[model samples]
Target: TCPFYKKIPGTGFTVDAFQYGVVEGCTAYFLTHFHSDHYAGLSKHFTFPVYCSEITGNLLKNKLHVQEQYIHPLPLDTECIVNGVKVVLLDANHCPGAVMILFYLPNGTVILHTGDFRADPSMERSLLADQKVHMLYLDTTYCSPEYTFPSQQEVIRFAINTAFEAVTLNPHALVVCGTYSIGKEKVFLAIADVLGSKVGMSQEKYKTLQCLNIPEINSLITTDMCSSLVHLLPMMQINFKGLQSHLKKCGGKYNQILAFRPTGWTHSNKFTRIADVIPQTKGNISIYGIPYSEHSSYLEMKRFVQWLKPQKIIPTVNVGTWKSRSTMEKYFREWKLEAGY
Candidate 1:
């Protein structure tokens, strides 16, 4: 009868499935990450104990204004008892504080919900990888085989190197990397470290970054420079109107802008280069889309399904109705041999 999202198959703890901003019944709510889509509707008056990583907890109190007493900050890979229930938080590897939730219910059932994350070896904690999961809630954002993007590290290195090269090639151009409000901090941090300079972002973004308490983020600076400047901006600010005006202040040395968007959709897109975005043009704005998605790709989902081989696959996204059995079968048609292992 649940129409909005998946509940822990047998157990009822809510994971990233709040209805608008209010979780129903005050059932203990656990957050996957602070992504606006995943962490919607959580109010300052939240009634349940919210479980998340330390970073997410900081955001909850400092930014979202949720009360501290109701917040539980989980250290990665650590097991804890909450309200007489055994729960463990593992790195989701999607963002700084993102994590997957693993619960051992009162009935001795093991439930796993992989909050939006790519398949990285580190994410496969021994407490989880060693078990035969009874139920699996999968991140099916790219659950078809058409997705085969490169790993996150590859994309990050490539983006940093490419941006540096662009500035070197044309001392008259600026490097602008697109990112979401909470995710993709590594790109800018690494860029700042490599360029031996400071990063730039909106004051609001800077505040969120501080919630992370990352020491390297101290590299953020306010004053602007002409060529060596690396601008980390939201996707909405990646246009000519946002960047073109800066050209006049730079004394014409940086006459162009090298723009890039880091996301997983770029995998199936026309752009094939994972290491760098093309200049597209010289004197005008050149746009490049990078494939550094933190969500599981189709093949990675296949690998996870085959590896875990859960009895049933639950899609994490909110759907009007769950996918039909036949539809899910098609998703795992080729990997039948690996099922149930």
Candidate 2:
């Protein structure tokens, strides 16, 4: 079954189902975060009562240009009834404005739908930490054994140090770090701060970052091409060719270029730490594929499943085909069995 199957069970609500047209009987729309994948197909044309965290709601209005009338921003860590079902939003560690939504159904079922999250120990202190969750709608982005990667803090540290050293070798090298619209900000932010270079980005991305409202981030941003040595671009543009083209656009301002491709896909069990993963090199370009991921590692997902001990889990991502979904389902079965379910 497709994870995009959309409708939340036992309720008239749908979670991140905008990509598909209106589902029958759907009364309320729930978005777990502002990421494009989750909020795909959301546009000015769609008109449904959408519920999300206050920050996400702000992003919807400001970044996506969704109207305020259709958006309902809920306070975090507090339960409010939605169509008679008690709903709560807990912080999802993946990105800014992301959340793990909890639903208390009238039939006494407790369901937690994690839009996308990086599991952390601090979540054990949340309200769902002690509750008996009947069904868990999980973000199984990396549900296999091989997806284990270093902690985000360590990855950020590695990226910062590596980028610093590269610049130390050549101060004129323009540093470009890849990023999603709302994730992996720490890598570039740290790089900009340590290198003491202003950040260059398109006004659109700059506005999205402003919506995030990180005080340290504001001072580092600049829209002028000549004003910043370090520029942030989308992940798709972090390759060697991309860097070369970008360098040309700057009119040869710098002698060389360095880029950090921060993603969990670059990680492997072959290396124990992120610092060990070496950078790739070509003429005038150096690419650091850092293991700075916003998604939970495979082991972290296991730990989260063990901690929650939910009766059942329905994965949200990588569920398009039978083989892909089965691999994750197999892990879920083993995890629940290991948890004494």
Candidate 3:
């Protein structure tokens, strides 16, 4: 019973299941990531035994401050049974602990949920290569032609180069960035790769990074890692005067300041007013507009649907209004024809 619009009524199965029923019937629930969209309704009314990768579990417990009693941490590529359904967690590679789940039922129905994932050839190839899926819950967020994003590695490199340029231009400037606490390890790693040192990360973040077990990326780190180089850390609760005082102590000598935010220009209204009031130093504050998103692009979504060729495709996590559902259905039809589905 996954909540679609409001909630769907059903006992064993229905097209759209209510959130409570979904939780109740679910032998074991697998959380794809720590993003609010993925697990937003969990702490509200549902308290089923939830499963996630170790990194995701750490993010939930540490960053999101979720209780540990209901969490069942599992590693990628392992198979386990929750209730009566057999499930496998595959690496999605969108963020540190993000994953795609494969649910194997005794009735011989195989369901694959591609939770908010990018079309990274490396990760996608690995996931689809070994697993055979029947019903696919595809991530069609970027199913429109207008949505296009750069590769994750390329985005990281560009952000790092930009940060280096900003620092070089103003050697005596503080470069602060905005990003979520859960998934910005790549940004910190990129900085470390460029600067030959680790960026500061919070203790909790450092521990979360360790859970990822990404040798290449995790090898370079010190402490207090940023979630992404494209977004600034969310520190709005701190008063402006107090923020300024803290920056002065930590970044007093800095010149060029760089801030990144997932909210980016879309949520600018919330923080733009503050920017006007914050005093600017000799090194001007620059907001770099980089489109480094975790979701798949339209082409990627199209490709994924074409490759999987599911009998009936369903979109979860997001509620589909008439217009939204129609739009998605049109895309699905177009892709089905293109792929000879």
Candidate 4:
């Protein structure tokens, strides 16, 4: 829940501030990822120099149709100078083109802005592992005690296993996997690889994947209708009514429908076992809501804060009102104290 306008307090740098138009006094504009929320205001009319990873830049150019001349694609893990500030882009582990930006200011301030990241163990080996950060612009989408879910790998395995079980039980069932334009790709790709099934998607989605340049993706994609038992659809269309209509359109080649909606919100701490999270059924249509999240969980966020120990943390989300922000701040304070800061 970040404010509509996002501007770093002490520097002229602005990260993911596109929707507000050209920010005043911003020397260089940096895009952390290709998500619509982050790159909202970007258009062909925009003239500011945009810095991002190569994949993200390509997406901006192809998807957004923004001119390439204004897009500056930076190499990951390489230090570069941007308006007197040293910067590096590290893999954010959230999505394909997402990155956690590290900025070394001219005034010797080290800042790490995690643009919608999922905290992972590999980040421990990053350059920031040994350095003390001054300010941390955090993605606090799940910065509470309740959102502690399983790791991405574990969830992917669960989704795969669930799909395998369902398919094994009813081989003729049409499996529909829900996904966004950019995220949750690994789940379906894993399902396709594990089940040895081709994936069906619209041309628009296939074109987006084409821009992603994911290895082994082209082989699994099929635009032909009814060619693949496993089909991909948007999250909103993964419901029973939608699946029923889709099945009707496919001319009843499949006897039943099985849908998988993979998102963090689907799982909760209230559920004791991960397996108990899904399998809502009505007639021949059954849907599994897996706890596959792109954002870092509660424990992961605490661990990240404990390890980084930034002097000040500026929450990029959950800051619209002081009540929610204060709750998140309480967690930060506890994490800092536990880390012996």
Candidate 5:
């Protein structure tokens, strides 16, 4: 009995591993996204034969250094079997290749693990969303009412606006965006489309993005950072020991540099105005931390829970930060009594 492992009750499947190491007796494994935290324990020793999206599979080999033979990369919406259990991968809408897992166990219980993602209401809901779920592994990052944030579309528009504003402020200043290695490609692509300038990325980022194979993006991005107006760099930096350092890294010298950190954490309890593009000055760099996120907002999670209607809703992250952590079930119960459920 692995007491500390995060697993779906009664199911032999595992969720999100990297440096965390694969578990034994796990008939199958699911990786939600390629965020460092999710793939922490995956190394040369990863032998659990995992399931993930094709883009994720490419990263597993290209970036994570895992052997190809042991990886089972899957296309979205396709069904496969692992130890007699039917598995389906659905887009999580969080980042490129992010996926949610739906498992049909031999016992007839249908379970879902919503790997870090945002629910797009405009997109057609999968037929599986209508099915009764015995257990749901939810992304509870913003589970409380305080985490209200702007939608991705709205945030993208704001980001573009801010990018244009920054460039307008300093014509010589280059735009530098801090984001996940593969995540947040949409913003860079959109910024390029709007500004009519190619997005600059490191060679590794350029190569990782080729897996996407979209001509529009390929043509809009260049590896030469100096020749480009916008530069995309990794968000958090780590040193030799592989420990995360709060100090982020930005490249190149500019007459002036306008940096942007796109994340939902910037939504301060600030009294009001979530859409405002707040500014900051660190040393010589001009930074703007946008309240942008790919996960469901507080309201969205409640809507998702009501729509899925799982027998038990499992808070996957940030559960301890909730106002009433003890009343785990009360999260849904209390929200249902309010509006929007």
Candidate 6:
């Protein structure tokens, strides 16, 4: 077993096992982002002094329901020494609370762990130039050319346009779409901006947005102001019957209701059987499918790897791992670089 190994029983020594052991011995631990894959075993197994950007910490505590006792919030772009290793937290533009963690060892080895980042030139150039990285562990979720996605802003714009057209055609319809509470709040804001009206979000979602310092996109209704455009209500309180009752009580004031599900209709169809039961009330219910994701695309990933010039690259969050490895290796070889462990 490797010196950095933590027991995995039947699995024996593995990357995860080694990672756990490293965290156990390290004086401080840095969480790259609040994503489930990145923080899966952290809260339960490791409790050392944990470090992350304040935004990430807040999201973990508030949205993920992680206890505050284990987290030590750190500011962005700040460097600190933890267990004899110099660590720096840099902005990762994939999501609001995401960050790229840079670890510098006294032995002159530098490793960069990019937690689900994109090739936003400004962001990449800034981070790479500011810190010269020798090694890199990247998020290769979308490492294949076929897995590319549009930019967040472009998806938002498309969603807004779709919603506006749908509303104009059927003003009394309620549009439902899926979005995560923390990350995709911008989509809601776009809807509001395009509709020129307040968008309604569940209180749970509103609170999540506020925790991320994104209350500006919250339901137009404010706790203190009655004239605001957006309104916040609990999710459980917005069922079909409840919506019907509320709309009736309003004396037909609101002819159209827009519901953002946070999960796109297509994804819901794949895993959610209940999606079939959710009747699409014509002119009353419309589903918007906008391609929006928070991970790096294949092109972005290739560009990032080329720029970093890492000796080896590993793909994560995808199937056919061996195939992905082969493909990445081919790309590196084509660039006149050799793969390494």
lDDT of 2 by residue, 1-341 (tens): 21345667889998888877777788999999888888999987778899998888889998778888999999999979998889999999988888988988888888899889998889988998767999888888888888877777788787778778888999888888887678777777888889887889988888888887677666888788688888988889888888898898998779899888876675365665665677789999988777777888888889988988887788888877899987887888888787798
Candidate 1 lDDT over 20-53, as tens digits, reads: 5554544677888888877777778776788788
- Winning model by TM-score: 4
Model 4 residue runs over 4 Å out of place are 1-5, 9-11
Name the 10 consecutive residues with the lowest summed lDDT in model 1: 317-326
- Model 6 residue 331 distance off true place after TM-score fit, in angstroms: 3.6
CA shift of 79, model 2, Å: 2.0
What are the TM-scores, per candidate, against the unseen true structure? 0.87, 0.92, 0.75, 0.94, 0.84, 0.72
Report, for every candidate in turn, its global Cα lDDT versus the true structure.
Answer: 0.72, 0.84, 0.59, 0.83, 0.71, 0.57
Tell me which of candidates 1 and 6 scores higher on lDDT. 1
Full candidate order by TM-score, most accurate first = 4, 2, 1, 5, 3, 6
**Least accurate stretch of 10 residues (summed lDDT) in model 6?**
4-13
Per-residue lDDT tens digits of candidate 6, residues 1-341? Answer: 32221111121112222144453334445566666655656544454556677877887677666678877776777777654456677787777777876667676667676766766667655646765666666676666556555577766666666668777887654444444434665766677667666655556665666666555544442342123233444445445565565556445545665554443224343333331223344345333334566677667776666667666554444534577678776765665443231
Clashes of 5: 8
On a 0 to 100 scale, what is the lDDT of residue 8 in model 5? 58
10 residues in a row with least lDDT, candidate 4 = 1-10
Q: How close is candidate 1 to the true structure, as a TM-score?
A: 0.87
Compare candidates 3 and 6 on lDDT and give the better one: 3
Error of 4 at 171 (Å): 2.7
